[PDB]
Design a protein around this ligand. Structure first.
Ligand SMILES: CN(c1cc(C(=O)N[C@@H](Cc2ccccc2)[C@H](O)CNC2CC2)cc(C(=O)c2ccccc2)c1)S(C)(=O)=O
Length: 373
């Protein structure tokens, strides 16, 4: 009993459904903080001043290795924003690779609706590319620094286990998934952009031009909770999901995420809700594969009553495959080969009748036209 990357297994945690974080130690002497893993941004930032929702924070004056870059930085997200100061310091991940690097670090001094009460994390690790980094692409992201300064392979993988998980850095651990890994191309290196070519609800094609699914863009984002879909796609998806679950009716607000519905302790009729499938462009011409999630992924619990929120929402900035999608699979961010792999997660939540799935190959033509330009 062991495994090459065994020490990195189960290195993620998450209080409630407020993100997944990994421990990271910065400065000298050591200052360890809980850092949110976010493939939807590219800045490494940590609370650096007292905040009502922070149990601890980065104290630069106590780190002898801290170097001030004398430059401010501001980062607005879909939800929240923070202001800070840039610098560099030594950074290691105790339950990650056995190395230490000097990386850029944004010390968060002011913030608005960023930190979350009870989340237990004090910072964020932007794992996306330099293109979307702030102030600009010259600020090298953490993973770029890790790869350039060490022998760590340019690849990381995530297994987010819903109701923490594993972030394998420099490789893959075969105990985190079952079946085979299917890869989709990273269309462009900024966000982890991918291309969705078909969508089905309980096997039924949504029947929309694939251009709508990627209108603007489609990305894999561990920092976003929901499966966010473009306006038109959202409306059509909701209509189909409602039709598929017609056995029982729910208020309009439920589908909008404004109303919660609770069931008796351990009585949620998962069987009445449909499974959702997204077909992704494959690595061979005209070949695709599909990933399928269950209501256990898109209906998220809320703090003897089990309350849930419909976690598929609308977006005006493209499709965002957030935690709702990632919690059903082991996702491999193979930066080295510009591709993202998906495999059924060994820890995903399911029941005795259904399971998440990754199947292929399928034949899909003109997938190149699905992308937005
Ligand atoms: C709009 N949605 C949404 C967006 C975001 C959000 O903006 N997350 C940012 C990181 C980010 C992380 C933490 C706090 C602020 C910003 C990502 O970099 C965003 N990615 C950019 C391309 C999308 C967070 C949550 C969230 O509730 C959440 C809380 C704690 C940890 C992880 C996720 C929910 S939604 C309701 O549709 O799911």
């Amino acid at each position: 009993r062991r495994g090459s990357f065994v020490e990195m297994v189960d290195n993620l945690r998450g209080k409630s459904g407020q993100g997944y974080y990994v421990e990271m130690t910065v400065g000298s002497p050591p200052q360890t903080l809980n850092i949110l893993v976010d493939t939807g941004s590219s800045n490494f930032a940590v609370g650096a001043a007292p905040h009502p929702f922070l149990h601890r924070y980065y104290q630069r004056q106590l780190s002898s290795t801290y170097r001030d870059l004398r430059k401010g930085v501001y980062v607005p997200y879909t939800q929240g924003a923070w202001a800070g100061e840039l610098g560099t310091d030594l950074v290691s991940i105790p339950h990650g690779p056995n190395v230490t690097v000097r990386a850029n670090i944004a010390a968060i001094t002011e913030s608005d609706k960023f930190f979350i009460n009870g989340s237990n994390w004090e910072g964020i690790l932007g794992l996306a590319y330099a293109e979307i980094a702030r102030p600009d692409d010259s600020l090298e992201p953490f993973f770029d620094s890790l790869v350039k300064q060490t022998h760590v392979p340019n690849l990381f993988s995530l297994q987010l286990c819903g109701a923490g998980g594993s972030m394998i850095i420099g490789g893959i651990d075969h105990s985190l998934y079952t079946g085979s890994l299917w890869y989709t191309p990273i269309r462009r290196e900024w966000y982890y952009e991918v291309i969705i070519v078909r969508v089905e609800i309980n096997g039924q094609d949504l029947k929309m031009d694939c251009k709508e699914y990627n209108y603007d863009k489609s990305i894999v984002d561990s920092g976003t909770t929901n499966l966010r879909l473009p306006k038109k796609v959202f409306e059509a998806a909701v209509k189909s999901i409602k039709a598929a679950s017609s056995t029982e009716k729910f208020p309009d607000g439920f589908w909008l995420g404004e109303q919660l519905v609770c069931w008796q302790a351990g009585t949620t009729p998962w069987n009445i809700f449909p499974v959702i499938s997204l077909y992704l462009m494959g690595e061979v011409t005209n070949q695709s594969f599909r990933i399928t999630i269950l209501p256990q992924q898109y209906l998220r619990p809320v703090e003897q009553d089990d309350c849930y929120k419909f976690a598929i929402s609308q977006s005006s900035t493209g499709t965002v495959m957030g935690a709702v999608i990632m919690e059903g699979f082991y996702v491999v961010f193979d930066r080295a080969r510009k591709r993202i792999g998906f495999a059924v997660s060994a820890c995903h939540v399911h029941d005795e009748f259904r399971t998440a799935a990754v199947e292929g190959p399928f034949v899909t033509l003109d997938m190149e036209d699905c992308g937005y330009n």
